[PDB]
Amino acid sequence: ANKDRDGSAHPDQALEQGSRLPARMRNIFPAELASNKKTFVVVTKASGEKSLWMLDPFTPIRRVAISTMVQPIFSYFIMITILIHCIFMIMPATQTTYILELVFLSIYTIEVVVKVLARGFILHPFAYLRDPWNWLDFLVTLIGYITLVVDLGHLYALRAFRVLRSWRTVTIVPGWRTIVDALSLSITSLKDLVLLLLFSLSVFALIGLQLFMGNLKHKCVKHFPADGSWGNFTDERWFNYTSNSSHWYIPDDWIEYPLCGNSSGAGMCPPGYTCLQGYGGNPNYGYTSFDTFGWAFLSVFRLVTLDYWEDLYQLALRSAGPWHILFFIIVVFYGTFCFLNFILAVVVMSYTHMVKRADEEKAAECVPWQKLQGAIGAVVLSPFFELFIAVIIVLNITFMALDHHDMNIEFERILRTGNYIFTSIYIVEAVLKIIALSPKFYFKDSWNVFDFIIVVFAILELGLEGVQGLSVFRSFRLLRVFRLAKFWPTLNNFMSVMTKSYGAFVNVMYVMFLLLFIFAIIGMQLFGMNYIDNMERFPDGDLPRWNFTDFLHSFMIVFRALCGEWIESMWDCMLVGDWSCIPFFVAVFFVGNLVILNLLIALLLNNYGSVQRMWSNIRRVCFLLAKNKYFQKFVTAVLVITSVLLALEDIYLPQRPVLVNITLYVDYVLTAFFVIEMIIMLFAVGFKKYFTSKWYWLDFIVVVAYLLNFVLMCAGIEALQTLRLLRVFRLFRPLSKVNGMQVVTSTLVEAVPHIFNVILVGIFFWLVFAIMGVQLFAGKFYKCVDENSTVLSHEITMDRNDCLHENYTWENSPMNFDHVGNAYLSLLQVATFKGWLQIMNDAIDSREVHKQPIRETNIYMYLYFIFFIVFGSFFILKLFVCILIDIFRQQRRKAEGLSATDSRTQLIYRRAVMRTMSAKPVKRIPKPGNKIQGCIFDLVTNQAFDISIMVLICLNMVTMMVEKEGQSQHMTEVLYWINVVFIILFTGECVLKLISLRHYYFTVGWNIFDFVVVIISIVGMFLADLIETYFVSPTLFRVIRLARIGRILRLVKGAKGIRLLLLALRKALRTLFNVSFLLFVIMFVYAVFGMEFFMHIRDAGAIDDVYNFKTFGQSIILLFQLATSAGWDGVYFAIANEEDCRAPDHELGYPGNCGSRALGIAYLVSYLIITCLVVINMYAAVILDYVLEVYEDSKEGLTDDDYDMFFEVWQQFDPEATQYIRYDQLSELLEALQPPLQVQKPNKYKILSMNIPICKDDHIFYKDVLEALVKDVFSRRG
Ligand SMILES: C[C@@H]1CC[C@]2(OC1)O[C@@H]1[C@@H](O)[C@H]3[C@H]4CC[C@@H]5C[C@H](O[C@@H]6O[C@H](CO)[C@@H](O[C@@H]7O[C@@H](CO)[C@@H](O)[C@H](O[C@H]8OC[C@@H](O)[C@H](O)[C@@H]8O)[C@@H]7O[C@H]7O[C@@H](CO)[C@H](O)[C@@H](O[C@@H]8O[C@H](CO)[C@H](O)[C@@H](O)[C@@H]8O)[C@@H]7O)[C@H](O)[C@H]6O)[C@@H](O)C[C@]5(C)[C@H]4CC[C@@]3(C)[C@H]1[C@@H]2C
Ligand SMILES: *[C@@H]1O[C@H](CO)[C@@H](O)[C@H](O[C@@H]2O[C@H](CO)[C@@H](O)[C@H](O[C@@H]3O[C@H](CO[C@@H]4O[C@H](CO)[C@@H](O)[C@H](O)[C@@H]4O)[C@@H](O)[C@H](O[C@@H]4O[C@H](CO)[C@@H](O)[C@H](O)[C@@H]4O)[C@@H]3O)[C@H]2NC(C)=O)[C@H]1NC(C)=O
Ligand SMILES: CC(C)CCC[C@@H](C)[C@H]1CC[C@H]2[C@@H]3CC=C4C[C@@H](OC(=O)CCC(=O)O)CC[C@]4(C)[C@@H]3CC[C@]12C
Ligand SMILES: *[C@@H]1O[C@H](CO)[C@@H](O[C@@H]2O[C@H](CO)[C@@H](O)[C@H](O)[C@H]2NC(C)=O)[C@H](O)[C@H]1NC(C)=O
Ligand SMILES: *[C@@H]1O[C@H](CO)[C@@H](O[C@@H]2O[C@H](CO)[C@@H](O)[C@H](O)[C@H]2NC(C)=O)[C@H](O)[C@H]1NC(C)=O
Ligand SMILES: *[C@@H]1O[C@H](CO)[C@@H](O)[C@H](O)[C@H]1NC(C)=O
Ligand SMILES: *[C@@H]1O[C@H](CO)[C@@H](O)[C@H](O)[C@H]1NC(C)=O
Ligand SMILES: *[C@@H]1O[C@H](CO)[C@@H](O)[C@H](O)[C@H]1NC(C)=O
């Protein structure tokens, strides 16, 4: 439609496009319309469409107006002034800077007056401004105006929103258009799933409001008033007593009250108190309870977004009882592992659709001197020397990464002389290679300059510390390590593929930093002041470590909200300002993580992807038995049933004295069974085809283990435990043959060799960061602490000597940077966002060795963790997902037939043509037997009845959103008697529909679901009499009624996008189930191996007599939490303690009570890889592969709807029985369909065109017509 404006409609005015001004006019003042400097613009082609048809350029001021409109320097002047304006904005206040702000305000007004006067009188300021840049540059300056003629008139909440001028600068760095519009399209498409997200959060909050209505208030109160002192009343004064807070139970120096509950297996708080309900107070200042709708919405959004959820988990389970985890699973599997990936799918799709246009457009275009020169040349490029220098730089990397903290003098001199030797050989062989060849081709390789640079640095480091320069170049000494890039092929490829496609990364990083800069300034101006005026509602009257007071702290808190954690800062904000802290943080999370970080993942994904007789007879008979189905079912069943029994080996096994005997008998018969079946199959398959096979080696290892364990009776030594648990692993062999677990195991076992390569590259980069973290922080982190765990401030203990003066102990903090090992550990803590606060605090405060740290100095050393986290967590750990998506796609394809040589486009046509086998039509039987009884259906099928019902659903869903704890007595009865009206109306309506069309009621799924739901409602309304004849317990009446919630999810019916996404989710369910199955078997293995190592532990950190490893149930209660790497710092600090232990005695009542450290490090770091990074991402891979396919099927091919909405015609366009037509109505049949499968009425020549085989005289079968239409629409669109 470009010719429309390139025509007599409303002509152009002028253009520049690089040094030529061809003006367009009213055609009666023609000048420069050719298309000598201009006919080269043709050559330049071999832009400002002004749209000013309002009035005339008659050489008024409008001339110079246009002349300055498009100009090389105007926009540049504006942009430089914006940059300097914001860099003044960064510093809070200054006297008389006010008048400067007046200049910076009045530049923009001349900028807008010229840009407007050059474009009309008033009329087109109504038509053409639809480009939003002008909207921005207009609204913000009008805000600047209104702020200046009110004189601080109690409105400082909008003087901040001027900073979003600076977005205008995103267009200064090249290659910026193919990213911005990507965000635009992603938002414009993400709307559709926003709707479903909203509805689903709502129904989950409604479910949670029923099960947990006001039990997070439970407290522990002393038994009775007393027998004595408090009096004699034992009546209403009782209520005066049990409300005086000062005898609720707080252990010591806490500020939260522990929760009790009195179900089975939770709380039971002291002996001497009792667990009372409903005495004021909620955890976290009163922002957590489920006791009304809004707070339930907040907590369920907190669960879905997967942020600091271990707190709510532990609270809810402490209160109600462990079975309640059957709730959390449902909101995690559906909301976080299966819904927050619809967003990833949408963003990836939009980005890969916007990159294609751009890239296709780009792709559419002394003589012995030289004698010994040859000699040394022979002795330089010889392959000896590359080997030699590679080995020497490896030994250099080794000698530059020891650096203990104390480091005895021998290490000192050793490392010194080593550095000397290494710099010497570097310099000498570099210079002799200089004199070996090419005194000037040398600087012509773009790779040897690096060596000269590092040599210069080594030399100057040798010098200026030989003089009194303190820390001159030992930092740049690190740069050796990157020289190890000529030798690895993997690392060389990883480097090249980024170094020669790099505009995208720069642009994305710039957008990211600019966005959170904008947010930081808005914050510093908006909340700001409230942290100093009030300043005392906090616990101990002092600014928390994270606050909006200076620019730096503000930047940091918005960054911390971007990386994933946004809730623990919302409480503080909302504690000093009543509201307007919720939209801010929810927005900075939503346009933060979920959009930009998903855009980054969408960018690493298209750049990095005679007795012999009976000898033979026995062989034959074992061969015959070994393959019978029943024997295989038997062995599988015996494995499963002897494995499940391995669970109930918990604490107080001895107190059940019969179990020990039965389990010993079981393991005896087990070792017999194993050794027998090995003989059987060993005669069966044959020797040499039994050791080279992978699976059978598992059986060999387990049988040799059971053998070595059995013979340990002649020695009388008791059977060692860790061997008799190797039984679990055989459980992996049958698992691999469930119908639909070929894809998952095949893709894992093919993905492994890439996982390992990425692990290696990550090890390398983290080494580069750690051997610097050591020299920056090693030796600090010490602190002087009293008998308690508190730090003497600054003057009671200035440095170490004073700390040892009066016996104040001199403690160390656990996570520190002494070795290189602890560096890896603490960095793995920083880069998974768990327990990364104490490290940053102690790293901020480190002043200098042997001296007490000050509360906040050395603050600029945040920049270490930011540059580490951008290059170690948004870039590497997000690369594991980008190798399971590709591999899963390839494996599904190559495992469902469908040969892999068809180029991604004819597969759509294939699925379309394949869809044409389930095409049976049908007709509704019209009308019942006699008139009035049948006169009911005549309207039940109408556009104003189901719509007249789908409002009752919404009204009912509102009347369930009012309940709250503390309802006055009258309210509950009116709600009760208002439910019955609906519960009878629904069944009345359903029975009318059913008695209308007498039979045939069950040909649709929705009718079946409605019938089931309504009978469930009508029986649940009665069974609400759970009182007076059955156990009167809250946690059963509170669940039996949930049935009423079923009749509201009927609301999703009818919307087409909210049906397309659900079709996508349903088309991939067996595979998703199988992935969850594998995750649970892994959790079972780890639970069993845990119940043995970590059963007796000293309570510390995060092990609180309800979340220990003692029994099986609590073991899974803990491991389901650790599966998402939520709170592993506490569990690690608890199981890896090795101080005061009371080591076992092996003499009487054998205790444990300390654990260890080796298999503490080796038990978690191998559970944050098998689970947190390799399976939880397979969820995303599967659902992304299915959603992307259903979209690209809808937008181009034929959707699942088109066929049945085609069938609507021919459903009530011909009768039921015969599937035939006689060629006449056929014609205007193509006038009763819809644009996808139809052509307009001039079709008789096309009906002549297509060859639909006329069958019997005048019967036309349908598949012919429909196939013709399918290939016709594929011909028209393509
Ligand atoms: C491939 C990788 C990628 C990642 C990346 O690496 C490569 O890794 C690097 C990361 O790790 C980053 C940082 C590391 C290197 C830089 C370190 C630099 O430290 C500076 O220097 C001091 C650290 O030694 C600190 O300030 C000192 O604080 C005390 C020491 O603990 C004082 O003792 C001292 O004063 C002077 O003592 C004598 C001299 O020998 C010293 O030279 C020093 O100058 C200074 O104090 C000064 O600094 C402030 C805080 O102390 C106060 O304003 C004030 O201090 C007080 O004033 C008194 C007199 O004035 C006296 O000093 C002292 O008693 C008082 O405390 C004073 O002005 C403070 O850290 C800062 O100054 C800091 O800035 C961050 C930095 C730039 C960052 C730039 C480079 C990175 C981003 C990263 C780099 C891309
Ligand atoms: C298990 O968890 C339950 C829910 O989570 C929880 O209800 C239950 O807590 C307590 O269990 C004990 C059982 O030992 C039970 O006694 C407690 O309830 C009693 O409530 C009485 C109500 O008195 C009211 O007083 C107000 C004053 O305004 C009045 O208006 C009311 O009409 C009502 O009378 C208390 O009076 C009572 O105190 C006792 O009352 C006895 C009767 O006279 C008397 O003989 C005693 O000496 C004493 O005076 C109890 O508080 C129950 N808590 C509540 C809130 O009901 C918990 N149980 C266990 C075992 O864990
Ligand atoms: C996902 C599918 C394919 C696997 C089916 C089993 C699982 C869903 C797991 C995870 C949640 C588990 C349940 C959570 C609740 C309970 C009760 C609890 O066990 C107790 O000891 C309860 C205490 C008591 O009531 O005496 C902890 C484990 C257990 C048995 C369950 C163990 C097995 C479950 C059903
Ligand atoms: C328990 O009863 C006592 C007296 O019956 C209450 O003490 C009174 O508390 C009010 C609170 O404002 C004071 O104004 C009165 O002066 C107090 N009485 C006397 C005699 O001084 C006590 O408040 C009751 N318990 C609770 C929790 O309110
Ligand atoms: C909660 O109990 C404490 C302890 O009895 C009460 O403290 C008493 O306060 C009154 C005056 O306020 C004194 O006369 C008593 O001597 C105090 N008791 C003791 C043991 O010293 C406290 O007042 C109670 N809470 C409320 C709200 O009254
Ligand atoms: C408590 O009240 C009862 C009510 O009759 C009274 O008999 C009793 O003496 C009172 N308690 C004391 C210690 O006097
Ligand atoms: C630890 O704190 C307590 C207060 O809870 C106080 O007795 C003292 O400061 C410390 N205790 C001891 C025994 O020193
Ligand atoms: C602190 O103790 C060290 C011990 O080596 C000593 O050398 C130093 O002089 C002492 N300084 C002060 C101020 O006590």
114 vs 11, 63, 67, 74, 816, CA distance in Å? 21, 11, 10, 11, 61
Is 310 annotated in a binding site? The answer is: yes
In the chain, DSSP finds a helix count (H) and a strand count (E) of: 53, 4
Token pair recorded at residue 157 = 């909440």
Nearest alpha carbon, ligand 2 atom 17: 276
Q: Looking at the domain assignment, is residue 633 inside a domain?
A: yes
- Structure tokens belonging to residue 675: 């050794």
Residue for token digits 């002028």?
14
Give the CATH number of the domain where residue 1262 resides. 1.10.238.10
Q: For residue 836, say whether it is annotated as part of any ligand binding site.
A: yes
Residue 1189 near residue 1065 (C-beta atoms within 8 A): no
* Nearest-angstrom CA–CA distance, 963 and 957: 12
Distance CA 1194, CA 906 (A): 15
Q: Do 780 and 658 reside in the same domain of the chain? A: no
Within a domain: residue 954? yes
User: Contact 164/518 with Cβ under 8 angstroms?
Assistant: yes
Q: How far is the CA of 799 from the centre of ligand 8 (A)?
A: 10
Residues 1045 and 1116 both lie in one domain: no
Alpha-carbon distance of 1071 to 1076, in angstroms, equals: 9
For residues 104 and 16, membership in a common domain is answered with yes
Which residues does a 6 A CB cutoff place in the pocket of ligand 5?
244, 246
CB-ligand 2 contact for 1031 (6 Å cutoff): no
Please indicate, yes or no, if residue 1192 is contained in any of the structural domains. no
CA gap 722, 1163 in Å, rounded: 14
Q: Is 1059 inside any structural domain?
A: no
Name every residue whose Cβ is closer than 8 Å to that of residue 979 and which is 6 or more positions away in sequence.
959, 1021, 1044
Minimal CA–CA distance to 221: which of 248, 261, 251? Answer: 248
Q: Coil, strand, or helix at residue 59?
A: coil
Pull the structure tokens for residue 986: 């629904």
Q: Nearest 5 degrees, angle CA 983-CA 984-CA 986? A: 70
Amino acid (one-letter) located at 902:
D
Q: Of 567, 598, 594, which is closest to residue 197 (Cα–Cα)?
A: 594
| Ligand 3 site, CB within 6 A | 264-265, 322-323, 325, 1076-1077, 1080, 1113, 1116-1117
Residue 1190, CA distances (Å) to 524, 885, 1062, 1195, 1197 in order: 45, 16, 11, 9, 10
Helix (H, G, I), strand (E, B) or coil at 273: strand
3-state helix/strand/coil string of 565-615 = CCHHHHHHHHHHCCCCCHHHHHHHHHCCHHHHHHHHHCCCCCCCCCCHHHH
How much distance in Å is there from the Cα of 1139 to the middle of ligand 7? Answer: 23
88 and 145 in a common domain: yes
Domain C-terminal end among 163, 178, 193? 178
Nearest atom of ligand 7 to the alpha carbon of 787 = 14
Say whether both 781 and 852 belong to one domain: yes
Residue 1144 DSSP symbol: -
List all residues 6 or more positions away from 1213 whose beta carbon is below 8 Å from its beta carbon.
1225, 1229, 1232
Residue to substitute in 250, 787, 789 for testing ligand 7 pocket (most ligand atoms within 8 angstroms of CB): 787
Q: Measured between alpha carbons, how far is 261 from 218 in angstroms, rounded to an integer? A: 7
Which ligand is nearest the CA of 1115, by number? Answer: 3
Domain hosting 587: range is 503-601
Q: What is the per-residue DSSP string for 811-851?
A: E--SS--SSSHHHHHHHHHHTTTSS-HHHHHHHHH--STTB
The C-alpha R_g of the chain, in whole angstroms, comes to: 38
835 is in an annotated binding site: yes
Say yes or no: CB of residue 1035 within 6 Å of ligand 2. no
The last residue of a domain, from among 831, 857, 883: 883
The residue whose C-alpha atom lies closest to atom 10 belonging to ligand 7 is 788
Q: 586, 593 in Cβ contact below 8 A? A: no
Q: Does ligand 4 lie within 6 Å of residue 244's CB atom?
A: yes
> Does residue 40 form part of some domain?
yes
Burial string for 325-344 (b: 16+ CB within 10 Å, else e) reads bebbeebbeebbbbbbbbbb
Residue type at position 411: F
Same domain, 648 and 530: no
- Dihedral sign computed on CA atoms, order 264, 266, 270, 272: negative
Question: What CATH number does the domain containing 431 carry?
Answer: 1.20.120
Q: How many residues does the chain have?
A: 1278
Q: Tell whether 617 is covered by a domain.
A: yes
Lookup result for tokens 């005048």: 1258
The total number of structural domains that make up the chain: 9
Q: Does residue 897 sit within a domain?
A: no
1079 and 1157 assigned to the same domain: yes
Same domain, 469 and 547: no
Residue 30 has phi, psi (to 5 degrees) of -75, 135
> Cβ–Cβ contacts within 10 Å for residue 298, how many?
19
Of 1150, 1151, 1111, 1155, the closest CA to residue 1131 belongs to: 1155
d(CA 401, CA 236): 73
Atom of ligand 1 lying closest to residue 776 CA:
11
Within 6 Å (CB) of ligand 7, which residues are found?
Answer: 253, 787-788
Q: Give kind and range of the element (H or E) at residue 1128.
A: helix 1128-1135
Residues 207 and 341 in one domain: yes
Terminal CA-CA length for the chain: 20
487 touches 760 (CB < 8 A): no
Residue 1062 lies in a domain: no
**Considering 601, 631, 653, which residue would you say is the last residue of a domain?**
601
Residue 1005 labelled as part of a binding site: no
Interval between CA 1163 and ligand 3 midpoint (Å): 23
To the nearest 10 degrees (0 to 180), the angle between helices 950-959 and 969-996 is 160
Distance 841 CA to ligand 5 centre (A): 41
Whether residue 1016 is found in the same domain as residue 1145: no
CATH number of the domain to which 534 belongs: 1.10.287
Helix (H, G, I), strand (E, B), or coil: what is residue 784?
Answer: strand
Paired sense of beta strands 219-222 and 783-784, if any: unpaired
Give the distance (Å) from ligand 2 centre to CA of residue 1194. 63
Q: Are residues 42 and 168 in the same domain?
A: yes
Looking up residue 1029, the CATH number of its domain turns out to be: 1.20.120.350
Residue 713 and residue 810 share a domain: no
- Between the CA of 242 and the centroid of ligand 6 the distance, in Å, is 21
Q: How far away, in angstroms, is 224 Cα from ligand 5 center?
A: 17
d(CA 817, CA 825): 9
**990, 1014 contact by CB (below 8 A):** yes
Resolution in A for the shown PDB structure?
Answer: 3.4
